[PDB]
PDB file of C-alpha atoms in Angstrom:
ATOM      1  CA  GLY A   1       2.872   6.976   6.507  1.00 32.27           C
ATOM      2  CA  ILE A   2       0.628   4.355   4.271  1.00 31.65           C
ATOM      3  CA  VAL A   3      -2.847   6.227   4.727  1.00 31.00           C
ATOM      4  CA  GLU A   4      -0.978  10.050   3.787  1.00 30.73           C
ATOM      5  CA  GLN A   5       0.689   8.653   1.207  1.00 27.98           C
ATOM      6  CA  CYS A   6      -1.751   6.100  -0.541  1.00 29.11           C
ATOM      7  CA  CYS A   7      -5.184   7.448   0.534  1.00 28.21           C
ATOM      8  CA  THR A   8      -5.435  10.765   1.622  1.00 28.50           C
ATOM      9  CA  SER A   9      -3.195  11.041  -2.149  1.00 26.87           C
ATOM     10  CA  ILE A  10      -2.551   9.203  -5.008  1.00 30.50           C
ATOM     11  CA  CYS A  11      -0.442   6.018  -4.109  1.00 27.07           C
ATOM     12  CA  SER A  12       2.570   4.180  -5.976  1.00 29.51           C
ATOM     13  CA  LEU A  13       4.287   0.990  -6.436  1.00 27.90           C
ATOM     14  CA  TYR A  14       7.285   2.493  -5.326  1.00 29.88           C
ATOM     15  CA  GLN A  15       5.392   3.868  -2.142  1.00 29.06           C
ATOM     16  CA  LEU A  16       3.405   0.267  -1.784  1.00 27.89           C
ATOM     17  CA  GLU A  17       7.004  -1.374  -2.047  1.00 29.50           C
ATOM     18  CA  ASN A  18       7.965   0.465   0.982  1.00 28.35           C
ATOM     19  CA  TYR A  19       5.910  -1.655   3.305  1.00 27.85           C
ATOM     20  CA  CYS A  20       7.128  -4.889   1.711  1.00 23.93           C
ATOM     21  CA  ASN A  21       9.019  -6.960   4.298  1.00 24.11           C
TER      22      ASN A  21
ATOM     23  CA  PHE B   1      -4.710  -0.718  -9.348  1.00 22.40           C
ATOM     24  CA  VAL B   2      -2.140   0.878  -7.442  1.00 24.62           C
ATOM     25  CA  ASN B   3      -2.395   4.475  -9.259  1.00 28.25           C
ATOM     26  CA  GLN B   4      -5.327   5.776  -7.458  1.00 28.05           C
ATOM     27  CA  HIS B   5      -6.269   7.192  -4.020  1.00 27.09           C
ATOM     28  CA  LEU B   6      -6.260   3.444  -2.001  1.00 25.52           C
ATOM     29  CA  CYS B   7      -8.192   3.169   1.934  1.00 24.26           C
ATOM     30  CA  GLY B   8      -8.963   0.142   4.320  1.00 27.53           C
ATOM     31  CA  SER B   9      -9.325  -3.369   2.450  1.00 27.78           C
ATOM     32  CA  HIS B  10      -8.847  -2.427  -0.614  1.00 26.61           C
ATOM     33  CA  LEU B  11      -4.860  -0.737   0.674  1.00 30.02           C
ATOM     34  CA  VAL B  12      -4.327  -4.144   2.024  1.00 30.66           C
ATOM     35  CA  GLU B  13      -5.587  -5.440  -1.153  1.00 31.30           C
ATOM     36  CA  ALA B  14      -2.593  -3.421  -3.368  1.00 30.43           C
ATOM     37  CA  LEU B  15      -0.289  -4.722  -0.331  1.00 27.56           C
ATOM     38  CA  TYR B  16      -1.485  -8.275  -0.478  1.00 25.65           C
ATOM     39  CA  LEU B  17      -0.843  -8.607  -4.296  1.00 26.68           C
ATOM     40  CA  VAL B  18       2.142  -6.802  -4.873  1.00 28.04           C
ATOM     41  CA  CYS B  19       4.471  -7.969  -1.947  1.00 29.64           C
ATOM     42  CA  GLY B  20       3.335 -11.345  -2.194  1.00 32.45           C
ATOM     43  CA  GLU B  21       5.701 -13.805  -0.602  1.00 36.01           C
ATOM     44  CA  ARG B  22       7.665 -10.988   0.828  1.00 39.68           C
ATOM     45  CA  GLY B  23       4.578 -10.359   3.511  1.00 39.03           C
ATOM     46  CA  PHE B  24       3.942  -6.775   4.514  1.00 40.74           C
ATOM     47  CA  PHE B  25       2.947  -4.416   7.372  1.00 42.14           C
ATOM     48  CA  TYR B  26      -0.232  -1.932   7.130  1.00 44.92           C
ATOM     49  CA  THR B  27       0.619   0.717  10.035  1.00 42.31           C
ATOM     50  CA  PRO B  28      -2.122   3.121   9.296  1.00 43.22           C
ATOM     51  CA  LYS B  29      -1.851   5.534  12.389  1.00 43.55           C
TER      52      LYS B  29
END
């Protein structure tokens, strides 16, 4: 989920946008 | 601001700015 992709690894705009509605 | 480790309120901040009026969901667990 977002914590694994953005907190315990380096986040990215591409991944952040996976969590916009 | 998005290309680093982002946790907690720092991650929510980033979602808020990127997603804008679309909104977002924050599901950490």
